[PDB]
Chain A
């Protein structure tokens, strides 16, 4: 299912600060940036990497929660739905 995506304004800076660059990326590229972004900003339970702490950062606002599990792609997809600008309908 992994399709191509396009990081908007507030979405580009996210991947950029994570070592990304450009205006085109797939689900695999984005997913890889997400993790790196969180680790770069330090928004997770060092004791449990599987437990992310969105707190109130960019990701926190986009999702609208407090924390989300990494090993559980539940809220991640729900947010990406309208967050990850995908193409091909």
Chain B
């Protein structure tokens, strides 16, 4: 249910 930074942040391809 929660997104916030996580929503976009996650996008950041660590690789």
Contact = CB atoms under 8 A, between A and B. Distances in A.
Contacts, number: 36
Helix, strand, loop or mixed for chain B's interface? helix
Interface in A57-79: 70-71, 73, 76
A27 B14 contact: yes
Interface residues of A, number: 17
Nearest to A38: B5
Contact of A39 (B5, B13, B14, B15): B5
Contact of B12 (A1, A31, A36, A44): A31
B7 A2 contact: no
A73 B11 CA distance: 9
B4 A49 contact: yes
Interface of B: 4-9, 11-15
